Amino acid sequence: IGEIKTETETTRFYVDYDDLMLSLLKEAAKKMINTCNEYQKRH
Amino acid sequence: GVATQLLAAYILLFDEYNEKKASAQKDILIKVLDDGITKLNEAQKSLLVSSQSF
User: Fold this and answer.
1) With contact defined as beta carbons under 8 Å apart, do B32 and A13 qualify?
2) d(Cα A7, Cα A11) in Å, to the nearest integer?
3) A24 shares contact with chain B (CB less than 8 Å)
4) Where are the alpha helices (DSSP H) in chain B?
5) Dihedral in degrees, nearest 10, Cα atoms A43, A29, A13, A5
6) Is the Cβ pair A17, B21 closer than 8 Å?
7) What are the chain B neighbours of A17 within 8 Å (beta carbons)?
8) Cα-Cα-Cα-Cα dihedral of A38, A41, A43, B2, to 10°?
9) How is it modified after translation (chain A)?
10) From CA A13, how far away is CA B8, in angstroms rounded?
């Protein structure tokens, strides 16, 4: 669960740049999609 | 795990000065470092109370 919480906190901090087209936030969101799909596949 | 990526983003984005993201970068820095000081201090106090129980 902590491996998911680290990525969630990183994405929440990248939202605070107030730039929704920032590539760093796009890549963090694409990483969280795969993390959540792997967690649902395991459970 | 969070701090080592936010600080790398700080080194990446401010190789030259970026005046548009300058007001938010300081808030991100203050927020993550004040979070870390509190977490590290509570971890030390927890380990000390565990050591005093023997």
Assistant:
1) yes
2) 6
3) yes
4) 3-13, 22-51
5) 10
6) yes
7) 21, 24-25, 28
8) 10
9) In outer membrane vesicles, the redox status prevents formation of the disulfide bond, leading to oligomerization and pore formation.
10) 13
